[PDB]
């Protein structure tokens, strides 16, 4: 259980990091985005 | 503890999925979004 | 393990909440955003 939860949390941390990058790009008009 | 953490993680996976969909809609101009 | 996972999940819940707010601001044109 714990091990699979660590796995899920680590996938979520990646997803959230990618979201943060894309949201910042949208807010700042980065590179015409 | 584990059970409530599984609950929290599963709510987060949904939230993150909805965010991903909304962010893609914003990036692609999907449906005038 | 559990304690550090609770920590990670709680940081993620904050990050996701901030993302949700920023994504809503982008969708609604809130305050010229």
Explained architecture:
- The structure is a homotrimer of 33-residue chains.
- By secondary structure, the first copy, chain A, is an all-alpha fold.
- Helix content of chain A is 82%, strand content 0%.
- Chain A contains one helix and no strands.
- Chain A is rod-shaped.
- At the A-B interface, helix 1 of A face helix 1 of B.
- It is classed as de novo protein.
- Keywords: Trimer, Helix, DE novo protein.
- The assembly is trimeric.
Can you summarize this structure?
3 copies of one chain form a homotrimer. Chain A has 33 residues and is mainly α.
Question: What share of residues of chain A is helical?
Answer: over 70%
Q: Tell me the number of strands of chain A.
A: 0
Q: Between the first and last Cα atoms of chain A, what is the distance in angstroms?
A: 40 Å
- Helix and strand sequence of chain A: H
Strand portion of chain A, in percent?
under 5%
Helix/strand-derived class of chain A?
A: mainly alpha
PDB class: de novo protein
Keywords: Trimer, Helix, DE novo protein
Assembly: trimeric
Entry title: Coiled-coil Trimer with Glu:p-nitrophenylalanine:Lys Triad
List keywords for this structure.
homotrimer; 33 residues; mainly alpha; 82% helix; rod-shaped
């Amino acid at each position: 259980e714990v091990e699979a939860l660590e796995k899920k949390v680590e996938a979520l941390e990646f997803k959230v990091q990618k979201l943060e990058k894309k949201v910042e790009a949208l807010e700042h008009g980065w590179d015409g985005r």
